[PDB]
Design a protein around this ligand. Sequence first.
Ligand code: A1IQH
Ligand code: A1IQH
Lengths: 261, 261
Amino acid sequence: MESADLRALAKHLYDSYIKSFPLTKAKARAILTGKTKSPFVIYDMNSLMMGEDKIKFKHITKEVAIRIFQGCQFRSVEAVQEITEYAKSIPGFVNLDLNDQVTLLKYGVHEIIYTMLASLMNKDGVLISEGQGFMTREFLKSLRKPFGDFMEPKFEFAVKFNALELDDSDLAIFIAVIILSGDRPGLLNVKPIEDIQDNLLQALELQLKLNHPESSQLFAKLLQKMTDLRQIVTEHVQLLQVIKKTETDMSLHPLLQEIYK
Amino acid sequence: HMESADLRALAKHLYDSYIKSFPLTKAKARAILTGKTTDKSPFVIYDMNSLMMGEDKIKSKEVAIRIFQGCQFRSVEAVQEITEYAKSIPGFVNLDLNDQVTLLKYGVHEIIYTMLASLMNKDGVLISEGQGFMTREFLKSLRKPFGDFMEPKFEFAVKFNALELDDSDLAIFIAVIILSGDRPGLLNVKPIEDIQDNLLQALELQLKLNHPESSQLFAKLLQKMTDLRQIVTEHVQLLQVIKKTETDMSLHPLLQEIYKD
Ligand SMILES: O=C(O)c1ccc(-c2nn(C(=O)c3c(Cl)cccc3C(F)(F)F)c3ccc(Cl)cc23)cc1
Ligand SMILES: O=C(O)c1ccc(-c2nn(C(=O)c3c(Cl)cccc3C(F)(F)F)c3ccc(Cl)cc23)cc1
């Protein structure tokens, strides 16, 4: 591709990423610094209750640790629909075989979720409820039984990922790259998938060089983070299997289980 | 950053050391696997009967166990060769001693499976310095847990070999693997990442110059480190299983210490 076509691709994805994801990294950072309506902090059991009364968190219609877990599931399901709409804007994506589109999203949404969750994290906690709340890392770590170690791997990824200091215009391309992974199981026609990823990778490379000229081999260092994402996804699955085998206060309305499957 | 002439000098240095440190190169392995070589033809082991003649021609346990111990013995020799190659990487021996050990502890197996790919095609693997060739089917047919220990390596090899790297490419890539700042327990991450930055720069230039028509080969190679990580994980699980089930069986001290955590 030509240099002007790569910038065009970059600007297109950035615009689409803005339309598809309400809470962008730039907005989340403003909130987390102290540079903008300040968020409601949840740092213990009592300030959780108060936050449910005042903000009426949609991830709270049980036991506290359970309700919080389930609330992350509710938000993940929301994120899936935002990512799915974003995918449709990727040039070439809707022209792929429909089963392949489903297959790419099925395996890619989780890597994307955690990529974008880092945008809402710092070393001390995570923004929730479209940025109206802030749940502290220490309050998450203090949840009983297996729920106390559910978010901590995400935080540890987030601190290292954020050190790369990507902005939304970088991330928009990076997210596209994740979706167009030709190595997903069951793909029927890998060749146009990798053709698109090649254009996205080229565009990501030029974008990082233009936007971070002083950050040597940021492109490679970003690609290596896809190892850290895949590992986090595998560990998450491990935690679910353990939860389903051990916790019985998990079951909800059967219709709820189907929504959250 | 570095100058082009410095990056070519680094690539030339590593390829030279790679030749000196690893007797059985990919180029040698492929010449043996292709043919038109009456002098280089291996003895082919495809069932229990041909294994017995192979003991006589190629040179008190059970077959599945002998085979598995064999691979462990050859993994030890590989660690030796990889260690010798690591000392040649500029900056490596200057690092904190504990970190050198940590980089090798977590690095060697990802390198073993990388270089094992060089000895493989979809139908089998060269053994005994290329004197033998063991079919993938005969390996898959081994009893108990040992029937599945090589198959993940084959599946990786098939996809890794599709990149068509040669030894000079692999010399830099192996260097990048060793100098991973993200290994657990590293004391001084920063001087490790400075080296890997120079190695990444050198690898990128090398791949562009050597495979000018292979678009984004650099990025595609970096994504292979996820497959490496997962093969290692699955091997670790198999060892824990063998330790609880095969009390006869012993391990080289070198491998025992690598495996500890
Ligand atoms: O491990 C997973 O599978 C997982 C975990 C969390 C999210 C996740 N949460 N989130 C919240 O901010 C949130 C909200 Cl909005 C309301 C209530 C609670 C939460 C929170 F506790 F989970 F944090 C997100 C916002 C954006 C995106 Cl992309 C992802 C998330 C996803 C997956
Ligand atoms: O699971 C692991 O961790 C593992 C497995 C195999 C090797 C391994 N074997 N090998 C053999 O030649 C061999 C022998 Cl000697 C006898 C029988 C079978 C084999 C072969 F099928 F595995 F190939 C190698 C040669 C070079 C290198 Cl670098 C690695 C190996 C290492 C680790």
